[PDB]
Symmetry: C3
Subunit: 239 residues, 3 copies
């Protein structure tokens, strides 16, 4: 896929909501049809049928499958066999081996556990990888913590650390870099601040969970002693 | 040991103060009997005798030995032979080899140097490791610096970086994660802030240097769009 | 070279300005004669001739060459053959191999790309390495970003992350640690804050781009429950 040619507004849509697929595609640059945490355990078989029955443009659609080693991932790959989709998102990505076993698909690795953070470079370097994303909430959950954000709304340090880790690992191997979802949908101010910062440090994408967030992300990724790299910054802004 | 079943308030007690061992055990969840920096060089032989003569519960007691390759560590392991203790804390932990040479003991690696930070994952993965701790002051000292904290009391960035490094490395290999001591004993407000943050990101323990800090830590580790990990956060709080 | 014995004020001087070499040497502790980004592409041959024609003290002078694999670096090493300089600075340093191929010269690796950050420990450990520096602007540029600093002037998180990475990697292998240039020359307050912090965490050097910054750096590297490392901090201050 030419995912880099699409804009920065990517949108999760649970795959057991086929009635919303067309609206998601209309709102977003890329749709992530979700078979993992956005779909209840009992609804995953229905989500797999909808995946086959209600196709979206495979050049602008990614499918988030279930974690490596799970029975659900096996059922997901069987369902995907009857689709035109070529790119999957791997949640709880924790090793190069988990990515490699998804070949010949293209893989966006979603790092959201301590093991994935420790192994981020190996995951990014794996041959099927085309992008890296991070997830603050599963990260904190699997660390045994209870909140990813400080009282003032900023991420706690370990989340900020993993965010930088994933940005560097993705960029070191020429992969797309995707920034974490902003869970507080009505907090447009906070999303605006995060997406502006993400654009400023070189993320390619901010992933959204609600279509109202897509215009905020698209606008944030547009701009408002000098050495050679500072001129590159100015040329990036013009672009 | 079932160190994870004990509470989060761990307390250093210098091993040349056997008159305080019982009070430390009464105040804390786990006692770290210290043969390293809490005991003056000339007092380490006396500390080793006290270690043998005044036993604490080996299921709730860790012994901090001296650094790898030192004559003091050799004397420590000889003294420990005449005790029931099974878990040691290794200061200036800098390689998997330093941990492995302490087998068959269980090892809590205290990372507090640049080399230890760079090798944190290898240290965490070593077979004897059961926990990781970090130390800001020895870290800054061995970097050649002069203070670990900013004017406003927050840790400087390299200390925050190592803290996250150790949390991730410990959690990636299922080890206990221990947060650094708060040296300003009377600064209860600052300890409260740090321990609340440590609990929120998934540290298991905040280590203390004064028994007055234990109630602050124990209280801080108790709690005051929703996806699956956010529900895990709420379940962790209830637990 | 005994670069560690020189003070902390290092100063870039473009090598096509030989009329300024003597003033740079008078102002700074160490001069970095620059064949890379400080010299326009068309002016690099003239800079190489000036490098040979206008010598500075090789015990207090480093030469920044061009990036590995470039034709310019090849021309730089040919020009350096007719000089007494023994230490080079490698920009966009990205692998141990790039450092090793500069043997038998001493190498200060300037890490300023995502790949260099991911490989910082391997770069620091390479046998020719004698120091590590980081560069925020090329880092942000090669990440595809557009600014290294927040609205309040602080570095964005990924720059802070790479700064700590380089400090730890340098110190883990006994290399000099050099902090990034402060591009806002007239912002003496901001330089003072950064250099004080750099000195406090154990950087050896803050690199400057204007001679007016050298006194600020030199002054900042002078100083204005207690365990063993806190006493080391106090002894470092007295020293
Ligand atoms: Mg998740
Ligand atoms: Mg220490
Ligand atoms: Mg540069």
């Amino acid at each position: 896929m030419n995912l880099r040619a699409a804009g920065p507004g990517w949108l999760f849509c649970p795959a057991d909501r086929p009635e919303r697929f067309a609206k998601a595609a209309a709102a977003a640059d890329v749709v992530i049809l979700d078979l993992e945490d956005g779909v209840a355990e009992a609804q995953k078989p229905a989500a797999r049928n909808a995946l086959r029955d209600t196709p979206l443009d495979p050049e602008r659609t990614v499918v988030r499958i279930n974690a490596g080693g799970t029975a659900d991932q096996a059922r997901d790959l069987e369902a995907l066999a009857g689709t035109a989709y070529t790119t999957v998102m791997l949640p709880k990505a924790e090793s190069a081996a988990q990515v490699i076993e998804l070949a010949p698909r293209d893989v966006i690795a979603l790092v959201e556990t301590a093991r994935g953070a420790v192994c981020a470079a190996e995951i990014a370097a794996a041959d099927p990888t085309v992008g890296m994303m991070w997830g603050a909430e599963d990260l904190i959950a699997t660390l045994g913590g209870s909140s990813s954000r400080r009282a003032d709304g900023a991420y706690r340090d370990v989340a900020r650390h993993v965010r930088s880790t994933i940005l560097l690992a993705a960029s070191a191997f020429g992969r797309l870099a995707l920034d974490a979802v902003h869970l507080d949908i009505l907090d447009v101010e906070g999303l605006q601040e995060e997406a502006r910062d993400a654009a400023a440090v070189g993320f390619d994408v901010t992933v959204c969970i609600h279509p109202s967030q897509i215009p905020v992300v698209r606008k944030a990724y547009r701009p408002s002693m000098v050495d050679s790299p500072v001129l590159t910054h100015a040329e990036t802004m013009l672009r």
